[PDB]
Amino acid sequence: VGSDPVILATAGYDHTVRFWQAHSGICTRTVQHQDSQVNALEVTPDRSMIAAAGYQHIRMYDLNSNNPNPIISYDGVNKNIASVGFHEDGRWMYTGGEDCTARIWDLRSRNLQCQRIFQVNAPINCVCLHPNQAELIVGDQSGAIHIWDLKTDHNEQLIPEPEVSITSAHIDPDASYMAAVNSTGNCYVWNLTGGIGDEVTQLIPKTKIPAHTRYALQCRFSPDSTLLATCSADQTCKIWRTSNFSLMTELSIKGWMWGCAFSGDSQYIVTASSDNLARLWCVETGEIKREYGGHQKAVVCLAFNDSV
Amino acid sequence: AAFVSCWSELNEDQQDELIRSIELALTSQDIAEVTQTLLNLAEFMEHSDKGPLPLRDDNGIVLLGERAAKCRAYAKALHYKELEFQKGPTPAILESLISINNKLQQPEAAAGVLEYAMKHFGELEIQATWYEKLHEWEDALVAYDKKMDTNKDDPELMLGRMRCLEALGEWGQLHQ
Amino acid sequence: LNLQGINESTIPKVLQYYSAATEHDRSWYKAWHAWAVMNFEAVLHYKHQNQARDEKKKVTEDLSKTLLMYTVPAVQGFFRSISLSRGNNLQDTLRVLTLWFDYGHWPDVNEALVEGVKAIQIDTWLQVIPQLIARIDTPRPLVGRLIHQLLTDIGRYHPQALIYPLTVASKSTTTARHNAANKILKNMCEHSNTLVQQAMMVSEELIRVAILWHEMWHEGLEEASRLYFGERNVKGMFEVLEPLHAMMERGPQTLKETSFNQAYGRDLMEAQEWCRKYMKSGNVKDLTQAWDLYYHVFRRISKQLPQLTSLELQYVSPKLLMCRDLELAVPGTYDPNQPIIRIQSIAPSLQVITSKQRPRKLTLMGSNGHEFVFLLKGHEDLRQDERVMQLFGLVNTLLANDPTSLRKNLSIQRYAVIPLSTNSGLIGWVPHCDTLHALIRDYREKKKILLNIEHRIMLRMAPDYDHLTLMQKVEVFEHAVNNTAGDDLAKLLWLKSPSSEVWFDRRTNYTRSLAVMSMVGYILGLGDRHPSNLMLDRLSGKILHIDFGDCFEVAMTREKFPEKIPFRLTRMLTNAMEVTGLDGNYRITCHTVMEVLREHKDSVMAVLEAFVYDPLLNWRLMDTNTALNKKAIQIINRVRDKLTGRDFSHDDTLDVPTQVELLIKQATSHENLCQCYIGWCPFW
Ligand SMILES: Nc1nc2cc(-c3nn(Cc4ccc5c(c4)CCN(C(=O)CCO)C5)c4ncnc(N)c34)ccc2o1
């Protein structure tokens, strides 16, 4: 599975995690995840193993061996886990749980406890890491965003005009913009400081885009920072260009459209939907270049590591 | 009961002849007795398990409602017109709904009909007489003034504006 | 009292104005009412100016001096305003009682109360009898004497209106209550001496047919085993069991009592001996032996029980069988104006409704010549229903006294409730009514539709519905809704009508009653309104609510499955209205009712306060946590916020048209509905 320069995986309600080869498309290995669904998947920077977040526990499988069942398990939390992250050094893991708390965990230290905790009002939806790997952004159902500093331990708060749930947020790789999306289909974009670290974090809102007419479920920047993708429940995935924030392309499947992943060079897009299938599209031509199927139930979470 | 008992054993060809005779009767006379008897028969057949009488490829909702309107049985007309609405709304059914509700002493239902029309059919489809039917003499005046502005002198709009002015009691402008 | 508010420079001015108004014409009721209410306000303003300031020696003495000039005028004005009403005067009476049980110990206020109580009629006190017996044993010494004297005076005349609650109070675990009740009953004895004995006998016999040994055990053993095996609570287990072993000791006094004892007495006695072995030994195996014996008893009753379908009085209570031509009035019928009606005799058989609670169906034969049917419940507290019914009566009067509401026949349907103890009671029998659950079940079985179609589709789409996140749940809910028709109720209501001109009136009544009880229940805080808790008439469409256990947002704060809804408004209920939607009768009736309620906030806040401040019931609130005074203050503040429009943001002040819209938006939401407990049927 891990031999290839690209790793692809998807999961949903059917209790199975499956891996696919991109060039032509065929399953190569399956893993069992009984007794719950999967909310998120993430591949560690070391390019070894993978983490799945579900109900009351986080599990880790392996990519290089391809034989074994879970290697590491974290248990003893309340309600669902909504997000997972990793530090580029592979020593700290950040999680925004359902029960109004964000937590930090140590991988090598096998003490079954989170090193640091940070509580907030209302459940947490998304968490994100600043490129400098010194700040953390958190979103909650109350409609507020929180900025937390790991080294100084002080936090600050923000609230856009509507008091509606924030569903996702993400900071591009060069720390030039930061965007968020709310359940009314609107997106907000804010400009950021040039340098990263030891900065005043001059978050000033450039504008808001009425991207959709229904719930928005995710948004991501391209690795080159040129493009910004936005999924939704209206069977539309829209791509905007960062130079002018104007629509470039609009992919449609007329189930919802959950996931979204870019390629290492901003050439392809990989998308998952609630119709038990995954699609690989060309960014420029806007045509389905391939399809992956085999799942019995819907597919909600996706993972695509295009690096080695 | 006799009609039901007989109809069940009839042959597909004899049923069509009977239906044709009933249709001819319903259209022909204004006899209050015959129309009431046939309407009661239709209702009774509706309540049973044999299905409603198959008149004129539509179950006769339009014809039955039209004939019930003249007989002055407004509940039946409202029921049939409500069935008509479910099949599909059009700006011509809403006016009849408003009129029927007004004839039945139920202004609030007519107000609800107007609210639905406002939400679902924009502006161009709204007529200035609907306000007149609801005794909203000010919105009708506003709409009539707006219409008279654009269009030239047409007798109907002028008469409508005069009618609206009379109810409020503006003797000055009316006399002018 | 506008453009200014309330201060220390304005109060004297307005008191001057109202005093002059009273002086110029000493027969107007409004002047006296306003003066009394204004004096009552001042007193409550100088207290929260102390708690807010003083808490956060000379102060208390200065408070005594200053505050002893507003209370006496308030009492006098309230009494004179009562004298000039002779009719709707509930608010003034409740205010008088509130002042009395808060400042009576002071000497001069007692003088004013003593003077006033003499000059009023005795019929003005028959509407506050439930609120007088609650304070029958007040610690203070100057209040209890006057309460006892007034209660005795209410006994010479109109005695039929005091026997039931006094008898209920006479059998209480706490000693002072039963001491006072027995003293008052003794004082009453020299008036009748047969009515009292008949009432005691009837109450005792009724409290007994309600629950039988096999039953008390079928549950005692269940509860004791849950405590011990489920929770390791040996002490709690014994606290359930010890009383049950003791009771049989008294010794059988009726046939059925003996047959249980003959079947199961030896086994139960031996189980107690094993438990008593444990008490000395400390060896848990001895409890295991006991539970082997208890389980054997439990299973035999478990299979014996289901076949009891009726009860004969001769094996249950011959005392009732022998009763003839009593002098006791039929429960819940006494009216000081109409002639009295007595119970001629009781029917010999009782029918047991097949359910988990197993309520009885009692029937009595009145002296008038008609039968009276009742429902006899056991294991259920029925006082919160009495209070709520009083409130509903007040609201009915308020609606009836308005022209716009009068032209529409807006009202609330109520029934009769009579408590007998802390556990059992009687409820009036309402004819021609059926729950929604039964109607939908019958319709779906007649048309041959699966009874759990929506839940089955939901589970098929994803068999983890209870553990999914929020956005995951809303999609499944929408999918389940979009692939089904929700027009069962409308179709059923059309079919069950004889003609087409009756269906119209039935639909109108249905819509208007639904709107009225939605608006009232929002303010009352009522919750837990699953389809089994509301019924529907047949000759009319008027709706009826029941089971008022939960109030004051109790269900919006619980830990497991907290509700997020102000009232029930689902698609099945909506489809049964006119084809256009909610913007017809429903919204306008909501506007009218909310206007009427907002105009008369004072009476509603009088009734709800006496209710929340009664010490015998405050138990429903403190249990929510995991002192009580602060919780009561918070509850009353929330109710005021609701009734003033400041219920979404304290800074704003909404008008009715705007608030109603926000409430209707909040109720019909998929995010809110998807979170409901699956037994709530959020899809019907
Ligand atoms: N607190 C409280 N309860 C009350 C009950 C009634 C009442 N209800 N009904 C029908 C009925 C009677 C018994 C049962 C059901 C329905 C449903 C099934 N069931 C269960 O026990 C399992 C269900 O979950 C037994 C009446 N018919 C005529 N007159 C009445 N007054 C009533 C009224 C006020 C009440 O106030």
Author numbering:
A (entry chain C): 8 to 261, 271 to 324
B (entry chain A): 1320 to 1495
C (entry chain A): 1759 to 1814, 1867 to 2436, 2492 to 2549
In the authors' words:
Rapamycin and a structurally related immuno-suppressive natural product FK-506 (tacrolimus) 2(16,17) bind to a family of FK binding proteins (FKBP), which catalyze cis–trans isomerization of proline amide bonds found in peptides. The most abundant FKBP in the cytoplasm is a 12 kDa protein termed FKBP12.21 FK-506 bound to FKPB12 mediates immunosuppressive activity by binding to calcineurin and preventing translocation of Nuclear factor of activated T-cells (NFAT) into the nucleus. Thereafter, independent studies identified a mammalian homologue of TOR.25−27 In time, this homologue became known as mammalian Target of Rapamycin (mTOR) or, more recently, mechanistic Target of Rapamycin. As previously outlined, mTORC1 associates with auxiliary protein Raptor (149 kDa) while mTORC2 associates with the auxiliary proteins Rictor (192 kDa) and Sin1. To address these limitations, we have developed a novel class of “bi-steric inhibitors” that interact with both the orthosteric and the allosteric binding sites in order to deepen the inhibition of mTORC1 while also preserving selectivity for mTORC1 over mTORC2.
The C32-hydroxy rapamycin core was also combined with the “rigid-MLN” active-site ligand to give bi-steric inhibitor RMC-5552 38 (entry 4). We employed cryogenic electron microscopy (cryo-EM) to determine the structure of the mTORC1-RMC-5552-FKBP12 complex. After postprocessing, a final monomeric map of 2.9 Å was used for modeling. The maps also demonstrate the presence of FKBP12, whose recruitment would only be observed in the presence of the FKBP12-FRB allosteric modality of RMC-5552 38. In addition, density for RMC-5552 38 is evident at the interface between FKBP12 and the FRB domain of mTOR. FKBP12 and the macrocycle interact with the FRB domain of mTOR with the same binding mode and in a similar orientation as observed in the crystal structures described in Figure 4. The ATP-competitive, orthosteric site also shows unambiguous density in the map. RMC-5552 38 makes hydrogen bonds to the backbone of G2238 and V2240, the “hinge” of mTOR, via the 4-aminopyrazolo[3,4-d]pyrimidine core, and the 2-aminobenzoxazole makes hydrogen-bonding interactions to E2190 and K2187. The strong densities at both the ATP-competitive and the allosteric sites suggest that both sites are simultaneously occupied by RMC-5552 38 in the sample. Unsurprisingly, no density is observed for the flexible PEG linker, and it is not modeled.
